[PDB]
Amino acid sequence: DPNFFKMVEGFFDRGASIVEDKLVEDLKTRETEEQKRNRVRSILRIIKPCNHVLSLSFPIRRDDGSWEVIEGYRAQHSQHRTPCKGGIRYSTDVSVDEVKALASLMTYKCAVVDVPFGGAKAGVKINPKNYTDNELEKITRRFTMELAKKGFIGPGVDVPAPDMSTGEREMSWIADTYASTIGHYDINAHACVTGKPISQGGIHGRISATGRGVFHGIENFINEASYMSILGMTPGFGDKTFVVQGFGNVGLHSMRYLHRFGAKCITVGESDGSIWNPDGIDPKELEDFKLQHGTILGFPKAKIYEGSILEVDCDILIPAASEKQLTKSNAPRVKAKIIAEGANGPTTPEADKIFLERNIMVIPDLYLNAGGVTVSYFEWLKNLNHVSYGRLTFKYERDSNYHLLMSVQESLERKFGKHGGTIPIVPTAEFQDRISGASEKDIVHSGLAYTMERSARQIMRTAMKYNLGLDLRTAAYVNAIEKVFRVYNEAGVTFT
Amino acid sequence: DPNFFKMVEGFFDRGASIVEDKLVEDLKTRETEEQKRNRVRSILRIIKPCNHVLSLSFPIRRDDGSWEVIEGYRAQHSQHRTPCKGGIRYSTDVSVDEVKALASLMTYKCAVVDVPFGGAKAGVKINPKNYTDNELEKITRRFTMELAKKGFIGPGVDVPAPDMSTGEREMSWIADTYASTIGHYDINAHACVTGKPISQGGIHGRISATGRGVFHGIENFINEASYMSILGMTPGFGDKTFVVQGFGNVGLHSMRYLHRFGAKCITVGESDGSIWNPDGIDPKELEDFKLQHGTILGFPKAKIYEGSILEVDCDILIPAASEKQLTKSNAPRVKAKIIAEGANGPTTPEADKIFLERNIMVIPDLYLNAGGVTVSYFEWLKNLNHVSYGRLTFKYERDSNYHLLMSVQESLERKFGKHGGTIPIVPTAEFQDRISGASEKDIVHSGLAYTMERSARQIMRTAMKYNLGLDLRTAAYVNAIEKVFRVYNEAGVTFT
Amino acid sequence: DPNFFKMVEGFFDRGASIVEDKLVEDLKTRETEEQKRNRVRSILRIIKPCNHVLSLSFPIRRDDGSWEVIEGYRAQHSQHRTPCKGGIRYSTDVSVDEVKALASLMTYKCAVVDVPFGGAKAGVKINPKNYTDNELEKITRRFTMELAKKGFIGPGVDVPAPDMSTGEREMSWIADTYASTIGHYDINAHACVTGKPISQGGIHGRISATGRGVFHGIENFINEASYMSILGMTPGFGDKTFVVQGFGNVGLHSMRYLHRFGAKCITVGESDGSIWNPDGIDPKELEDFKLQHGTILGFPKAKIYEGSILEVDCDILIPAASEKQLTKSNAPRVKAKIIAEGANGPTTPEADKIFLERNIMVIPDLYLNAGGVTVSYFEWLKNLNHVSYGRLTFKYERDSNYHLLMSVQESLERKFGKHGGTIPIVPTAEFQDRISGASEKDIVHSGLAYTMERSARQIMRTAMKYNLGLDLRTAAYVNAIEKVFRVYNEAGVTFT
């Protein structure tokens, strides 16, 4: 199993090698062909590595009164778009290479979904299970101070985000620390971090963001007859099964949104075991059973499945757990028609090459796992705007809709002759429910769906334009590299 | 031919002399009548001249290794609204008087279209044809640095713009230089300049901005029966001909948008000759013929017209070329019913006085040439917002429209008794095309049209309120002076 | 040969282990003995590692038009005193571990000479011999920009300095870049870097700074009878010989200043060979011979010495060349009574342990190589003051001295009875020369000598207080650790 750094390097190298010929041809400036070739190679060389990596060593005082030195890292991959964006991970396994690779991955993911952020990633080398709430808060605030002093945290410079190991309370601590010490005179101080709770400037709909993004990315390619023909399927969600690996937030919400639109789930596996029921599994039953039992084992409405969760006889495989689980050990045995990677880097390059032969579709995490990033961009915009979405427009649009219905009613009675005849003033039950429960999360989900659809169409266009098959990962990486190169080329690189 | 400085001074003097009587009467504060008269005279005296003019002399190193001293100027006319806005012109003919006059013109143009910018203008005394791309970039970056150090460039202070002689690449250089050296810690650094390419924070629809503004300003007065009666015409665009002077971006886009709405073009003239075809000229044919041939001469579908392009037997004359082309030499020979000035100051005051006698309508460049300024304001707002227009609302409004259509369908079947009867769920072909191709440029063009309509109505109201005839220039200048005086008076002038 | 990182770690560990018992005892606050022990251990643990390490990857455009990615690092060891201070090294061999070790060494060196700077070190992974002047300037300016954006360059944050591989022109480039882009609004922008040329705010006397510091550190221990007894010598500089390893700036100036005060040199060795003359070698002859011949080989007034320069039958060995040249391979053969380390880390710990047995004095580079740091502190102070030393006081003190002499003359004639008798108005030839040639370098050298004397006395006091013998390195490290601990303890560490 190659490391994520080498994986990202290989993906970028392949994408750049594919895209360079077009990058050279589209240049129409007053130089020679070989000068254009060298310029394109040079800009790619500039883009590939991380620009800034900061290693930190700061002290904290333990609860008992002892002192501990904490090691932390933050890598900013690209500054072609500011601010940089990236999560903070609290783990003993964090490393400079890992944070650099994840920062590069974030850079390329933001480009795919047209989010104007650079890539970043931070890691603190602690095990949070061995610290109290007070000590964790002290660590978070000291990390925030040290990063802010060196220009690695800021609303216009670098906006961190939560991870699996960090949460909304950590983001609250970061925002509170920045807004009160370093960014006190900055009106956008609370835009320095996303993933905040609602009372701290968070955005509505962030909880189901990644799951909804996974669902939208799945459905965009599901409703595509051109790819459905090669995969041997039918358009729509009918007669389709899916399984999820890991039942975290991403997997749970993806399962719920897939079950909503008519798809049925078969089995749900984790590291502590796996459930299995071919007739359909209810996401709410799984949710409340897990909420009570602390685990998924012992579900009375399903049974135990032997072997890995990746080899079930299903249609769509959705891994939302530990990464690099798809490799040559189990790649030729999965027998899953579509692979929907809800996690970052769950498929090795050799596994992907195997799936290419077997006509197996792999939807890259560059595109599918970008819903949370889009909603974080929306939250950052909301903090910049200092108002929630729809606050000044919901009642106005409601009045406009009522006026439109009234106009239709009067016109219908006036073509006729009536006073109380045809009544096209009644909105449908779904429309009335939408009107009554109109909130910021509706706008957020609408924007997320729009972003997912646009990105899917761009990826498809790139795939057909470069004669690519079912390897959507190559098309997505090519698209991201093209966008980043365009920004670099039309801006200039050196000011000296 | 009087200089543009004297022309602007005369326009302002006439407008102030007309508007002063009303400016005095509407004042309802606790002073005397003569004190009010003196206060109004005083505020007009304050408004008339430019506030700040900066003369620059900075060095560059040539490609061969020699050094050259570059002279540049930037004039900020008014600071009653910040930031100031104005273009940068690369020409040997630039001068302090010219940049001051153009800054004043920009101040008065922004007021007409309700754009909250002061007026500004910059000029660099070089001939860009005698420099390479590298040397031009060095000149642009050094000019940006020198202006930024003295508070003459900034998102909240002064936002430059392109001209005919400068372009999107120059704006890219300016934005890149400012965002990396002086405005590095400013979150709105890229709002320091407009006219940027799309990848650098530019706005969609800027290319056709001035042409669309010219078309909207023409159609606003075309659809006005009160003025059509005095001009002896019919409302609408039927049985109307137009010719353009110069086939630049402004003239080309104005011709295209006029041809779209049913108007027919007769002849297109430039400095290298003129084409002529009374039966109709196709803008796309002209566009691609010019793109291939580098000029307009030799068009197989039309013939040569002798004499100046300003004396054709047409209905609407649209000069979009060098200025001061309408003067006593050719004023009584033009025989064009309406003059639509798409360029800055193409008519001399004596020519305008001649057109007043001959019942010839002159639409001022203060109003007609303000589409680019409005779209630049939109681009500045987009940079401040850090998101493109419609990103969070397109899908939401699409869902709302579908729900409205569904409500109408169900209500129609329910007044009736049907399940699949009347089907008012189908949007029209034009509506469906608008829904499918909904983008930021649609919002930009909608805002531009709204601004043009509001400005046209305000100008008409001022014209009828001050007993003015077809001299819309006087009405527009009076309106701008009134707005600027209102801002000055309600704010106060001296803080000491 | 262990690496410099492990060497510094071992030196710090030994010093902390020696000093901890006293650090605990002198604490008189309201806690328990074991709490004091843990607090001291904890502060030492905080002090030991580097606080911030920044890894950079920035592009430059080559002269031929190609692009290259440059890797650079800057490590800030301690922020207990701001700004941090450290040199910039242009070499292919630079590494994160090396820059961290050198930053720690700088932290401990500044404490010894009471210079209020933290330690820092920067390295750029290029070979300057393979670049032109223009490319080197581009690299320097881009490095300055990248460091300044991340808070790693600044008059109050971090002040870089030259190295052997970087020079006054590089410091000029750094100062010019910072003062014009990021620190434009900072009145102390030119204090961001030291080692500048005179016309750029440099200080007089920097050239001979390190050599004069080496001479002063040597003479302080030479004039100490208490150590002279154990070494079996006589106080003064009579009947004393010295040899230098490497004839760089440090070695040349140390040789010149030692020859001035009556000491005689025997041989001068480098990597290209070695000269040898037991009867005395003239520093000016060596200087101009090297200036003409580009090397030291072929000196007509001396002969070739076989073997290493470290094993000559002399009294004082002064290495001013590559580091780690003293080790077990040649340690028991040197036969040099006193070792005066003018270079950073030229003696390995095993070599030092060997010299301890053989009653061989080793003067640490922590103290002896700190003259340049002191003069850099003086230059930083001069830039902050915006005036050269003595500008407002030289003439005043000259008038005061003349008045004192006149007072003595009149009093002598008035005790006597005379008008033109005793004439104590004539200053000596040396005093008159000092008065006539009074400049800033005299004040700089006076301050350097004062700093060296104070540091030597403090080191001696620590050595006798901790029962240390001739291992002055341990005493110096103990003194630096004590000072840093005092600052940390009396300030506090965590603000949370």
Residue numbers in the entry:
A (entry chain A), B (entry chain B), C (entry chain E): 6 to 501
Per the authors:
To solve this bottleneck, we developed a cryo-EM support film using 2D crystals of hydrophobin HFBI. The hydrophilic side of the HFBI film adsorbs protein particles via electrostatic interactions and sequesters them from the air-water interface, allowing the formation of sufficiently thin ice for high-quality data collection. By testing six different protein samples, apoferritin (480 kDa), glutamate dehydrogenase (GDH) (334 kDa), catalase (240 kDa), influenza haemagglutinin (HA) trimer (190 kDa), aldolase (150 kDa) and haemoglobin (64 kDa), we show that the HFBI film can protect the specimen away from the air–water interface, solve the conventional severe particle orientation preference problem, improve the quality of the cryo-EM micrograph by forming thin enough ice, and produce high-resolution structures of small proteins with molecular weights as low as 48 kDa.
To test this hypothesis, we studied the orientation distribution of GDH in a cryo-vitrified specimen using the HFBI film and explored whether its distribution can be regulated by pH. We found that the orientation distributions of GDH changed at different pH conditions from 5.5 to 8.5. Under acidic conditions, GDH particles mainly showed top (“triangle-like” appearance) and tilt views, while under basic conditions, GDH particles mainly showed side views (“worm-like” appearance). We found that without the support of HFBI film, GDH always shows a dominant top view regardless of the pH conditions, which is significantly different from our observation using the support of HFBI film. With HFBI film as a support, we collected a large cryo-EM dataset of GDH at pH 7.5, which is close to its isoelectric point (pH 7.66). After several steps of single-particle analysis, we obtained the cryo-EM map of GDH at a resolution of 2.26 Å according to the gold standard threshold FSC0.143. The cryo-EF analysis of this dataset gave a factor of 0.84, indicating no strong preferential orientation problem. We also calculated the Rosenthal–Henderson B-factor of this dataset as 76.0 Å2, again suggesting a high-quality cryo-EM dataset. We found that the contact site in the top view is highly positively charged at pH 5.5 and becomes less charged with increasing pH, whereas the contact site in the side view is less charged at pH 5.5 but becomes highly negatively charged at pH 8.5.
